[PDB]
């Protein structure tokens, strides 16, 4: 049926940690990049800077994340960052218009065809992989903020990432992963008990695809040309020749 008082408290905590993702931009440079009618590779990297830095505030304002060692925090963010962007990408994507629409700034759009400027031999595989992952997440879950937030935390708290060597980090990360996943299970039954089992059973599949798309996205900026004027953060997750 309905959620317990305890889960609702945990959903408040989750809602607060993600409340920064959709806050208004404060800088005008960032707003101006998002306003452009055409985004080149450098522009896409600056846009990602916005999301990545917000993704980092989210994780820091997360109690569970503060139970991990400092080196384990770096490791989880370094390894899950692209996947979490790709998830956010899915939830603000308009399959009809073929563009991304940031909640933080209406009237602002990013053409899907921005891929046609990325690494030439891989860009087509990525477009398809993005749209495949998108289509593996049903409408009702994709449109549900808390549902994606919980899954965002499930991908974050991945115990098998490079860098997680501390047994304590591994154990606690596995435990969080398991708890978050049980939360989503109960949550999906509270908002639509009709197809909850089917929906929940589908997300693991969709997550295997996410991992695949996000993995071979790291070199998308190779052969895209000069990106030396782009934000530096994003260039720590994406390979560049500049």
């Amino acid at each position: 049926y309905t959620l317990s008082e305890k889960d609702l408290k945990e959903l408040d905590s989750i809602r607060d940690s993600f409340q920064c993702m959709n806050e208004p931009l404060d800088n005008d440079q960032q707003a101006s990049t998002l306003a452009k009618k055409e985004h080149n590779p450098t522009d896409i990297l600056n846009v990602m800077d916005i999301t990545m830095r917000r993704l980092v505030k989210m994780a820091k304002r997360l109690g569970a994340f503060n139970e991990i060692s400092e080196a384990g925090k770096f490791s989880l963010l370094k390894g899950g960052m692209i996947e979490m962007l790709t998830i956010r990408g899915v939830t603000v994507f308009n399959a009809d218009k073929g563009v991304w629409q940031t909640p933080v700034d209406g009237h602002s759009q990013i053409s899907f065809n921005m891929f046609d400027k990325l690494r030439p031999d891989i860009k087509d595989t990525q477009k398809k992989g993005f749209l495949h992952f998108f289509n593996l997440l049903h409408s009702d879950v994709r449109k549900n903020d808390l549902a994606i937030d919980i899954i965002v935390l499930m991908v974050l708290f991945d115990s098998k990432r490079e860098g997680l060597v501390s047994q304590q980090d591994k154990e606690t990360v596995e435990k969080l992963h398991r708890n978050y996943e049980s939360l989503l299970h109960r949550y999906l039954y509270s908002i639509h008990k009709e197809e909850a089992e089917q929906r929940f059973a589908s997300i693991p599949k969709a997550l295997v695809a996410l991992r695949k798309v996000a993995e071979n996205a790291v070199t998308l900026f190779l052969g895209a040309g000069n990106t030396t004027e782009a934000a530096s953060l994003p260039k720590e997750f994406f390979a560049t020749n500049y």
Partner: peptide
């Protein structure tokens, strides 16, 4: 030595 690390530490 790493923006990501610096954001984390700060």
């Amino acid at each position: 030595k790493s923006l990501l690390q610096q954001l984390l530490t700060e």
